Amino acid sequence: TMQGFGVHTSMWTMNWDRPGAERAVAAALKYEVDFIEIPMLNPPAVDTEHTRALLEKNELRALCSLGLPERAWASVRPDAAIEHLKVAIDKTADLGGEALSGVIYGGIGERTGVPPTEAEYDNIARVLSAAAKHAKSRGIELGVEAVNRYENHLINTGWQAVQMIERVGADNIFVHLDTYHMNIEEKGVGNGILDAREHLKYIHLSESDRGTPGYGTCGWDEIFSTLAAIGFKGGLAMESFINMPPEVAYGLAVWRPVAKDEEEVMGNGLPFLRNKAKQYGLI
Template identity: 45%
Template sequence: ATCARTLRQVAAYAAERGITLGLEPVNRYETYLFNTIADTVALIDEIGASNVTVHADTYHMNIEDPGFKPSLEVARGKLGLIHCSESDRGVPGQGNVQWDEVFQGLRAIAYDGPLVLESFAAINPDLAGATCMWRTPSYTSDQLAREGMAFLRERAAAAGIA
């Protein structure tokens, strides 16, 4: 209740300035406020402001949500942004995220917002520590960007949401 009340005030302040807020559900190992897409949609409904959206992240969804497609369907009309991140934060398509299901879900809700590649390479010690990257990845930053974007563009086009 306190979270919703506070975010309602933040949403009103943001709305006066033409700003949309995106609430990102984060896995239980990092926070406890809202961990799933369904939790986030319920919170957004409680806030009751049209400028508050779901900011999905496939990394966290892979840990917390019961499935990519059904969870994205819960966010229908409320999904503002999606971080496309692999299960190990590496190159999309080289981990355990079920990308076909992700893109089926996005297509099912007629999502036309941005697809944001969010992956990490251990090039900055502060970022590596903040993201708990304790080992050196097998890919470079350039490889991550090049291969990750190519993969996401191909999958988006195949799903008809490019």
């Protein structure tokens, strides 16, 4: 269960190869965060012992996220999804990760053009029940990230994520919210946190255009006040798509730069988020 402030490492590498891991860890120490979120584009390619040693040497904690590739979208190909998640779960555990979170129930770009069906949710629930048991056997948790309607048609709101978690009824699955998605989906941004309050262990603090937090349209005071009010003691992870490699940015509809450079995003956005966290007593 994460604690404090962290950063999504896409700001310094989307590929967790050896130089990428080193560059992300160095950045994390520079900005003095408590944890990093490691994206696993290609789980088999990850050097678990290098990463584990980096994290322990520099007293850094970690979790991992992914989205399922189309060959393994849980809604329609659940056995492939179980297989893909078991690999990702095992890499996460081996490198010292405490959790695998993100769109672990489908992939960026699912859309049937109609509302989500019961059969789609049944497959997801089966995929998630299997994956959670494999996660508990390796001592880690699983996260369900609500994402906006355009990225996935199945889980877009805090309350939909909670409804999936109750179906499965596994102890070790938590909700993962993202203010960039909440800014589109939640009927008042605080409502996402409210609906998910019993299961919220992680939140992406991302600006409305994936740019510099504080300089967009997210209602930060509402967000931080509501987190304080529910007693949120999970992970506060900054996410910006700045200096994300172009072929992974184009995939999530980044057609133009989200901010000038890392030095605007991290120099303005991290102090802003940490000050707000202090202001509302989360620290």
